[PDB]
RNA sequence: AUGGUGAACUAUGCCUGAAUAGGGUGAAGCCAGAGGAAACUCUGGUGGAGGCUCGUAGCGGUUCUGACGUGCAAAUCGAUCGUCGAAUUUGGGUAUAGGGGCGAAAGACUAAUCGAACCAUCUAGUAGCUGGUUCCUGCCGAAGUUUCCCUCAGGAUAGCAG
RNA sequence: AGAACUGGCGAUGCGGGAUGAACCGAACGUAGAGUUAAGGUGCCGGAAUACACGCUCAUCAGACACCACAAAAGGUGUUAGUUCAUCUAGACAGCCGGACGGUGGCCAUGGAAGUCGGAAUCCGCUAAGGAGUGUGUAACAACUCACCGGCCGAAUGAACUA
RNA sequence: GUGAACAGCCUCUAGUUGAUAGAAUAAUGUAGAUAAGGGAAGUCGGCAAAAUAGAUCCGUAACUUCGGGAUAAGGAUUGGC
RNA sequence: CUCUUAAGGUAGCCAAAUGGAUUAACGAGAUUCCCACUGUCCCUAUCUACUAUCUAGCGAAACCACAGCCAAGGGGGCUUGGCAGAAUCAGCGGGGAAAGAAGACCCUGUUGAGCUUGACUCUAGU
RNA sequence: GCAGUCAAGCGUUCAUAGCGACAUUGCUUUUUGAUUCUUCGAUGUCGGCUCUUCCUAUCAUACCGAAGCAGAAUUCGGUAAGCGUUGGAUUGUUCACCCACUAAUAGGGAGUGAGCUGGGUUUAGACCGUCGUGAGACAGGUUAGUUUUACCCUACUGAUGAAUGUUACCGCAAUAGUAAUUGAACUUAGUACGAGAGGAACAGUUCAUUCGGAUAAUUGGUUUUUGCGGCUGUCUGAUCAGGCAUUGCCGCGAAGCUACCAUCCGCUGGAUUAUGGCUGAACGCCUCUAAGUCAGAAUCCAUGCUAGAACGCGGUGAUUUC
RNA sequence: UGUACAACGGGGUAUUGUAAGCAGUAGAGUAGCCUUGUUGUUACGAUCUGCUGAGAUUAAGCCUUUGUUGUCUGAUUUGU
C-alpha cells in the first residue's frame, strides 16, 4: 500500500549523524581557492561570540520594496581581538590526498597557547617549547631547513594562529590556536609572509573588512538528549495516545525487517558543527575607538557594549565583527570566521552598509535607555543622591 | 522553475562573476592587504620601540624497524 | 502575487486560519466574512492555510445583506489583530481583523472602507489605497 | 454562488435506488406512497415509467398517505384526480386511530385473489422518504412493526412483513428521484431533507411564508403583523426567547425549527388540487 | 451414580436492633382582604405534602484513548457520575441445599467454584485421538494393492516377508 | 481430465547439476592403490588462459532448459546460402542531356494547361518520354521520376532461408 | 473560624511525623497547569479540557396529564469603610 | 347471474373540551444540530511534582534447543555474495521457536449435556 | 465476442483438402451535440493517525520534438523519479464525486493484524422483522460490551571505551550521508507577434511558497527567580513579620527555553539523456555514426556541507633523579 | 603564592511598584466636649497625602570590582 497522502522528509539526511561535534572549535573543512596573482592573505580568522543586538540599516537595495527605507535588522557580535602568529604547516598534495609535510613554530610562544597543550597547566613544569626554542639559538639551521623544504614541497602552506583569550572577558585562559590557510603569492611569498609574522599579531580588520559576506563555522549550542517531536519537528500524536504523544508512530513495514537509517529517532540534539555561509559584515570595529556603537546619524558617542554589559559575556574592549543575522553557536562560543568560498553573484554581496543606529540598551531585560547617562537624565536624581 | 544546478542560471551567473563582482572581490582584497601591511609596519615600529635531525631520524628508523618486525607495512613487506 | 496585486508582498505573520470570521471593512452590506479559503497558500499536510494583512481571500458574507449572502466573493484583508512586524521594527496590531470585498481583479465593491487600514494592503492593493479614509 | 450542499443530494444515493429495484424485482404490487398535502410534488414519475416499461405486470396503486392534514375535499379531489391515471386510496397512518385500514385490506386481499396461482404475493412501498411507508405497514400490521421517525432517512434496507399468509410487505428506503425540473428549494419542503444540516435555512422562509397562509400561520405560532419573513423569524425568535447571547435572536435555529414544524405536520398547509373538471 | 458437607460470600422471606448535613420547590388544611345572592373566584399569608428535587455521610458503579496490568488489589486507585427518607442502607438472630434453593429472570447468585456448588467413593470410568514407550551388533527384510460386507466408519480375505 | 502399463521416491546414503523430493551419474562393510562415470579444467576450485574451424559486440550480451512462452513479426547489425533477373548490344552509383507532337484531350468553375476533382486513358513521333511520379503556380511557367541517351568501366539487383 | 452546611480550607484538645534513602534535573512517561491569532478547521465521535457555577434582584418560551417545564432562556449586581 | 371504485376552491362533517400515540415529566439510554468556550487542531512551546537517570542497601518474574548482521538462492545451520574488532550506557519498539491467546472464525469422531417436540421406550400425577 | 470477407503467407504432393497474419464488414438506443439529466443483488469488511523508503507506467517543475504552433494558451510525443503532489464536505469506511486552493493536487509497491485507534470477525444482555409446532436460526435491522513487551537478542538513534612506548596539540580524508524547492513582481513591454481582441521570453533585478540548518537582538508565549506586589480563609494577641491552603489565587515578571507566533542563512565545476549538429564512410547519391566529434535536462559525478575508519594515515610538542 | 581562586561587600544592569515607622485633619460620617463655632473642637474612621521610583530582589548559566576574609591539598598511574 503507497503512502495516502504525500509528505516531504521530517528533516535533513546530510547533517547526519546528528552526533556531538568531536570538538568545541568547529574545524574548517575547504578554504577558498587559492589564487597566487593576488598578495598574501589569510582565508579565516577566529573570534568569540558575544551575542546580539539591534541595528536600524539605511537600506540601499534598488529594485526592492525597501529602497531607501529604514529597516531594521538583528545582528551577531563577535569579539575579535587580534589572533598572533605562531607557526607555519606545510602541505605536499599526495595521491591519498593532502598530507602535513612540517611544522616550525615561533621561537617565543605564549602561556595562552602552552595552556592549549596541557590538561593540568598549573601542575606542570610548563616545559612546553623548551626544547625547541634552542633551535633558534644554533642561528636557526634547523628552522631554516624545514622552512627551505616547506617553499621547495609544500603546494599548500597554512599558517598556525591563536587567539589572545585574555583580551575577552572569557573565564577560561586556554588560547585557541588553528590552521589558517594562506591564500595569494606563490609558496615561497607565503613561507616568508608568515617567517616574518612569528610573534606578530593580525588585527581582524586585516583579514575581513565591511560589507564582506562571510561564512560562521562554529559548533551549535548544546541540548542535550532530545525527542523527536523537537530533534526532527515530527507531528504530535494525540491527547493522551497509549506509550505517549511525543513520539513517531509507526517505525517499519513487514520489511525491510529493520528500522531504517532514515527514520526519526531520539538522541543528541545541538553541539554539532554546522557551517553558515553568506553573512554580510556590517560594522568591523575598533577597540580603541571608543563610539564603536555610534554612527553617522547617532552621535550619541557610545560602544556597542550594552549597558550591563552582554548577558554571559562582559564587555566588548576588542575589535569585533558585527555580522547580519544569527551565527551557529552561543555566546562565548569560539567561532571561526571564513572568506566565502566563490565570488558571490548576489546584489546583497555589493551592498555598501549605512547602519543608522545600533541597540545598546541592556539585554538583561527591557532595556529602555542607550546610555548610563541617559537612564540618568530621564529618572533624574534618587535618593542616593541628596 | 530553474534549478541551482540549472545550466542557464549559472552561466548567467559566471557572465556577472567577471564583471562588477570580481572586481569588487579583488578591489576589497587589495585594500585588506594594504591594511596588513599597515598593520606589520606597525608593530615593527613598536617593535624598534625596544633527515631532519637526530630526533626525526631515530624516530623514523625506529617506526620503520618495528613495522619491518611486526610486518606491518603499507608500502614494505 | 495575486490578480491586481501591486508587486511583492513581503511575509507577515498569519493571522486568519480558514474558518475564521472577519469584519466587512466596506460598506457593500455584508457585516462579516467567513475565510473558506486563501489564494496562494502552499500545500503543507497538515497546515490550514492562512491569511493575513493585505492577502486575498475567498469568503462567505454570513451576517448582513440577503443580497450578498449564499454566495463566495473574494476579499482582501485590511486590518488584522495578530501583532506582526514592520520593518521600521515595530510589532503592530489592530483591534479587530476585518477585511473588504473585491472582486478577483482587485477593485472594491464598496465605496469606502471605515477604519484603519494595514499600508501593507493599502501598498500592495492600489483599489483599496483609493478607497480607504484611514491608512495605517 | 455557494456548492450544492449534501443534503440535498440525499436518497439519490445508489444505495437507495438498488433497494428499491429489489424491493421491485421482488414485488407483485408496487405501492407508491403520496402525501396528500403535495400529492404531484411527492410523485416519483420516472419510477412509474420504468415499471410501465420493464414491469408491466406489477402493479402501480397509489395510496395518498397523510390524508388527515388537509381538509376533506382537499383529499376527495385528489383522489378524484390521480384515480383517472392510477387507482388511488386514501389513507391516513396511525396504529390506533387509523382510516382506509380496512380499504386497503381488502383491495390487496383482492390482489392475492387475481394471482391465486402464485402463493406468496410481496406487496412493496415506494415513495419520498418522509411520506409515510413504514408507518402505513405498521398501521396495516397493527403495531410498531417497521421504524419511524420524522427524521428522514430512517431505514436503510428493505425488510418483509409478512401481513397474512398470502400476503407480504416490504418496507423501503425513500428515494428523492434527480430531475433537475424540480427545485432543490423543493426537495426541501417535501420532507426529504434533514433540515439541521441546511447551512442557511433563514432563506427558506419565504418559502414557509408561500406554502402556509397567514391565517394560520398567525395561530400556529402567536405572534402577528410581520412585514416579511425575515422578520417574521425575529419576532417568532424574540417570543420564544430563542435570543443568542448578546440580545439577537437565534434566527438560523429558529428557521430550522420552522422548517421542521412545517415538514412534520404542525403547521397547516397543502397545494390546492387541480380545477374543477 | 452412591453417600455426604456448605446460606461466614451471595439470593430471598422472617424476628430483633441501628444509620441517613444543609438547601430548592411549596400540596391539602387554615387565616385575613376584595368580588358575587350563592356555589365559588381573585389577592396576601400560614402550613409543610412528596416512592419531589440540589447535594453530604451512606449506598451504587456511569464515563475516561485515565493509573495499574507478577498490581497495593485473583477487581484496587483517581477523577467523573446515579441515588440519597426511601420498593433505603445495614448488624445479629433465623429459614430455604444441589437434577435442589433463591431469583424485580441476567442462567443471576448459592464461600475467588455454577450452562448445574463442594467433598469422598464406585474409579485406575470409558479413547475414534494426542504425547511418550529405556541396551549393542549381525543377518533377512516388506507393503503402501487386488476381493467382499449398499456405502463412511469398522472390518474379513488375497498380495508382498518369513 | 479418465483408463492401462512401466519406472522413481516411501525405507536410501554417495559423485555431479553453486543450492534442492522429482535431473544426470552411481552393486553403501573397514582401508590402500589404480581407473572412471555424470560434470567439468581463467580464479574462487582438483583439472589445458589446450589445439582447431567459424560466428557474435548487446547504452545492463550470453553462458539455459527450446515440435516452452512473451515468439508472429520489426532492424540501412553481421555472416553463409537459395531462386530469379540484368550485364563490354556497357551492369549498379553518379553527373550531363532529351523527357516531344495532337494537346490547354473531355466534363467541371472564379481558375484547374499531366499534378483540387469525375470519367476516358488513345494516337503519332520515337532512342525514349505517363492524356503523367512528386515539389510547384490563382492558373501557367520551372523543377522532378519513369523512360531513354552521352561520360565511366565490371560486376549488380530482388525476393526468400539459416 | 469562614460558610447554608457534619462541604472544602485553617486552627485548639488528643495523636502522628509511619511509607528505603542520597545526588542530579536528559528524552519518554504519570499527575497538574499556561499559552499569542483563529475557534472544532482536529476526530469515527467537541473525547478531554475550557466556559458556567454561590447569593440578591429583574425576567423567563414551546408544550403539558395544568402538577410541571423552570435554576428554562436572558439580564443587573456583589469588597471595604 | 348481476356489478363494485370521480365529494371542492385553505379546514368540513361533527360524536355524550377533545377528536390524541406528533403523549407532559423523568433518563449516567441511542442520534442530530446550534450558542458559549476552549491547545482538539493550525503548531507547537513552556513550567511544577514524581519517575526515568546515578549511587548505598534490598532484590524478583515472564521466558529460555542452541545461537542471534544483511542480500539472493535453497520447488539463522546449506549455497553464493556483502562483510566482520574487546567490553559497553541510555533510548527505542522494525524483526526474532522471543514471549505474550494461538486464542477467535473453520473441519472431522460416533462425544458428553442443556433445552424442545405426536422421534422411541418409560414414568410421577390425574 | 460471434458470424462473414480478402489473402501476405502456410500446407505442399491437389493450392480447394484445408490452415491462415494484416485489413475489413455486420450486429450494440432515433444521424442535426436532444437525450441516452439514469441509478438495477460486489456475501467485501478494511481504514486513518503518525512515519520511512522504493517504482516509473511523469501530474507538476527542467530540457527537447511534432502540430495552423502568429502571439498567448493548448494538444500529442521523447529524456527524465532531482524535487514536490493540499485544505475541507460526504457516507460501514475508502475511492468516487463535491467545494476550493494549488505548479500539480500522478498512479502504484513494501507497509504499518494485538506502535495507537474506528467499525466489523464482537462471545454470555436486550429489542423488532422473517422463518420454524417448538427449543431456536436467520433475508434482516438496532443497541451495550476488559486485552496487559523489551527488563532478552538484534536493528535503529545517540553515548563511553581497553590496547597497539606514554602524553598533548594541529590536521589529512578512505568510506558513508547529502538539499534545496516552486511561484510572481519590476525591467526587457504593452515590445516581438496581431485586422483586432490580446500579448511572450532570454539578459538585468526583488520578494515569496514548501523544505532545511541554525539562532533569541526584538516581539509573543511560558515562570518555583515563589523576584516583586496584591487577594481570600485561617493561624501566630494587634502592628510588623510570617505559616498553611497537594506550586492557594491574581497582576507584572528578568534569566532560560522557545514560535514561519520571532529572525538569519542555504553554490558551482565537469560528464551525459532526449534532441540539435560537424566531419564522414558504409553504398561513386546521400546520411548526426560506423571511426571521430560540438552543444545539450531539475539527471549523474564531483565542489560545497555532516561524520571521521573507535584495528586508516600525517605533522608537531614534552617525555619522570635520587 | 598570583593582574590566582573563592566567600562576602561595593557599583552598575535588570524586576516590581512606592517598604517599616511617624506625621497630617485629607477624609463618607457617627459619638462626646465646650469657645455654639464655619480649618468650633476631642476621639474613632476604609482610604488619601508627605518622607518614598521608595523598599525588596538582582546569577543561582548578568556585567564589573583600588574593599574585607580565607585557600592553594591530597590520591592514582604511565618508558620506546
Ligand atoms: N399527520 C400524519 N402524520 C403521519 C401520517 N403518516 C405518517 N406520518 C408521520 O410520518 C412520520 C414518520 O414518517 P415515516 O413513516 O417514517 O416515513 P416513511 O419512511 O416513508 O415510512 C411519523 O412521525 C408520522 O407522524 C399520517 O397519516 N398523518
Ligand atoms: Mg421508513
Given at each position: 500500500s503507497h503512502r495516502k497522502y504525500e509528505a516531504p522528509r521530517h528533516?535533513?539526511?546530510?547533517?547526519?549523524?546528528?552526533?556531538?561535534?568531536?570538538?568545541?572549535?568547529?574545524?574548517?573543512?575547504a578554504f577558498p581557492k587559492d589564487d597566487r596573482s593576488k598578495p598574501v592573505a589569510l582565508t579565516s580568522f577566529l573570534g568569540y561570540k558575544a551575542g546580539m543586538t539591534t541595528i536600524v540599516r539605511d537600506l540601499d537595495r534598488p529594485g526592492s520594496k525597501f529602497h531607501k527605507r529604514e529597516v531594521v535588522e538583528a545582528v551577531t557580535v563577535v569579539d575579535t581581538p587580534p589572533v598572533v602568529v605562531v607557526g607555519v604547516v606545510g602541505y605536499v598534495e599526495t595521491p591519498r590526498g593532502l598530507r602535513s609535510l612540517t611544522t616550525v613554530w615561533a621561537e617565543h610562544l605564549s602561556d595562552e597557547v602552552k595552556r592549549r597543550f596541557y590538561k593540568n597547566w598549573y601542575k606542570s613544569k610548563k616545559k612546553a617549547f623548551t626544547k625547541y626554542s634552542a633551535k633558534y639559538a644554533q642561528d636557526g639551521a634547523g628552522i631554516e631547513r624545514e622552512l627551505a623544504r616547506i617553499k621547495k614541497y609544500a603546494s599548500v602552506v597554512r599558517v598556525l594562529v591563536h587567539t589572545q583569550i585574555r583580551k575577552t572577558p572569557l573565564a577560561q585562559k586556554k588560547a585557541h590556536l588553528a590552521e589558517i590557510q594562506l591564500n595569494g603569492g606563490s609558496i615561497s611569498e607565503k613561507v616568508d609572509w608568515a617567517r616574518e609574522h612569528f610573534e606578530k599579531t593580525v588585527a581582524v580588520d586585516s583579514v575581513f573588512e565591511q560589507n564582506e559576506m562571510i561564512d560562521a563555522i562554529a559548533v551549535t549550542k548544546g541540548h542535550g538528549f532530545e525527542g523527536v517531536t523537537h530533534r526532527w519537528g515530527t507531528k504530535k500524536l494525540p491527547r493522551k495516545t497509549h506509550r505517549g504523544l511525543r513520539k513517531v508512530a509507526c517505525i517499519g513495514a513487514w520489511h525491510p525487517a529493520h528500522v531504517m537509517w532514515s527514520v526519526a529517532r531520539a538522541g543528541q540534539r545541538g553541539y554539532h558543527s554546522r557551517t553558515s555561509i553568506n553573512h554580510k559584515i556590517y560594522r568591523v570595529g575598533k577597540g580603541d575607538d571608543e563610539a564603536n556603537g555610534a554612527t553617522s546619524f547617532d552621535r550619541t558617542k557610545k560602544t556597542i557594549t550594552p549597558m550591563g554589559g552582554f548577558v554571559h559575556y562582559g564587555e566588548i574592549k576588542n575589535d569585533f565583527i558585527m555580522v547580519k543575522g544569527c551565527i551557529p553557536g552561543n555566546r562565548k562560543r569560539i567561532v571561526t570566521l571564513r572568506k566565502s568560498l566563490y565570488t558571490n553573484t548576489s546584489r546583497k554581496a555589493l551592498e555598501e552598509v549605512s547602519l543608522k543606529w545600533i541597540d545598546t540598551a541592556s539585554k538583561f531585560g527591557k532595556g529602555r535607555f542607550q546610555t548610563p547617562a541617559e537612564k540618568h537624565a530621564f529618572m533624574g536624581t534618587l535618593k542616593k543622591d541628596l | 522553475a530553474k534549478s541551482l544546478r540549472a545550466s542557464s542560471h549559472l552561466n548567467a551567473k559566471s557572465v556577472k562573476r567577471r564583471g562588477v563582482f570580481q572586481k569588487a572581490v579583488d578591489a576589497r582584497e587589495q585594500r585588506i592587504s594594504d591594511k596588513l601591511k599597515e598593520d606589520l609596519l606597525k608593530q615593527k615600529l613598536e617593535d624598534l620601540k625596544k633527515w631532519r635531525d637526530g630526533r626525526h631520524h631515530t624516530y623514523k628508523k625506529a617506526k620503520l624497524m618495528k613495522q619491518s618486525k611486526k610486518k606491518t607495512s603499507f608500502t614494505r613487506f | 502575487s495575486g490578480n491586481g496585486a501591486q508587486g511583492t508582498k513581503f511575509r507577515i505573520s498569519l493571522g486568519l486560519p480558514v474558518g475564521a470570521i472577519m469584519n466587512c471593512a466596506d460598506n457593500s452590506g455584508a457585516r462579516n466574512l467567513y475565510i473558506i479559503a486563501v489564494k496562494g497558500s502552499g500545500s503543507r499536510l497538515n497546515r490550514l492555510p492562512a491569511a493575513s494583512l493585505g492577502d486575498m481571500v475567498m469568503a462567505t458574507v454570513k451576517k448582513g445583506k440577503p443580497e450578498l449572502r449564499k454566495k463566495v466573493m473574494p476579499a482582501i484583508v485590511v486590518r488584522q489583530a495578530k501583532s506582526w512586524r514592520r520593518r521600521d521594527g515595530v510589532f503592530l496590531y489592530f483591534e479587530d481583523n476585518a477585511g473588504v470585498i473585491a472582486n478577483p481583479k482587485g477593485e472594491m465593491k464598496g465605496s469606502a472602507i471605515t477604519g484603519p487600514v494595514g499600508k501593507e494592503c493599502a501598498d500592495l492593493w492600489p483599489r483599496v489605497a483609493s478607497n480607504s479614509g484611514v491608512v495605517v | 454562488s455557494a456548492a450544492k450542499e449534501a443534503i440535498f443530494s440525499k436518497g439519490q444515493s445508489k444505495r437507495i435506488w438498488n433497494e428499491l429495484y429489489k424491493v421491485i424485482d421482488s414485488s407483485d404490487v408496487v405501492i407508491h406512497v403520496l402525501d396528500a398535502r403535495d400529492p404531484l410534488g411527492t410523485r416519483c414519475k420516472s419510477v412509474e415509467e420504468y415499471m410501465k416499461k420493464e414491469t408491466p405486470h406489477k402493479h402501480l396503486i397509489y395510496v395518498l398517505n397523510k390524508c388527515d392534514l388537509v381538509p376533506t375535499w382537499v383529499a376527495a379531489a385528489w383522489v378524484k384526480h390521480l384515480s383517472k391515471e392510477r387507482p388511488t386510496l386514501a389513507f391516513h397512518a396511525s396504529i390506533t386511530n387509523s382510516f382506509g385500514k380496512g380499504s386497503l385490506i381488502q383491495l390487496l386481499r383482492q390482489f392475492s385473489q387475481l394471482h391465486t396461482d402464485r402463493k406468496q404475493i410481496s406487496v412493496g412501498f415506494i415513495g419520498y422518504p418522509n411520506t409515510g411507508k413504514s408507518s402505513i405497514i405498521n398501521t396495516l400490521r397493527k403495531k410498531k412493526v417497521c421504524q419511524v421517525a420524522?427524521?428522514?432517512?430512517?431505514?436503510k434496507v428493505w425488510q418483509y412483513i409478512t401481513l397474512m399468509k398470502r400476503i407480504f410487505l416490504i418496507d423501503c428506503p425513500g428515494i428523492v428521484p434527480p430531475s433537475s425540473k424540480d427545485s432543490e428549494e423543493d426537495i426541501l419542503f417535501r420532507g426529504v431533507v434533514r433540515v439541521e444540516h441546511v447551512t442557511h435555512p433563514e432563506q427558506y422562509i419565504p418559502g414557509v411564508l408561500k406554502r402556509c397562509q397567514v391565517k394560520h400561520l398567525e395561530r400556529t405560532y402567536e405572534i402577528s403583523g410581520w412585514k416579511d419573513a425575515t422578520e417574521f423569524i425575529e419576532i417568532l425568535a424574540r417570543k420564544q426567547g430563542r435570543l443568542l447571547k448578546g440580545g439577537e435572536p437565534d434566527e438560523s435555529g429558529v428557521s430550522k425549527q420552522i422548517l421542521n414544524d412545517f415538514n412534520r405536520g404542525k403547521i397547516p398547509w397543502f397545494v390546492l388540487p387541480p380545477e374543477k373538471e
Open positions: 528533516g535533513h539526511l546530510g547533517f547526519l549523524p546528528r552526533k556531538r561535534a568531536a570538538s568545541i572549535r568547529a574545524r574548517v573543512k | - | - | 420524522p427524521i428522514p432517512g430512517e431505514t
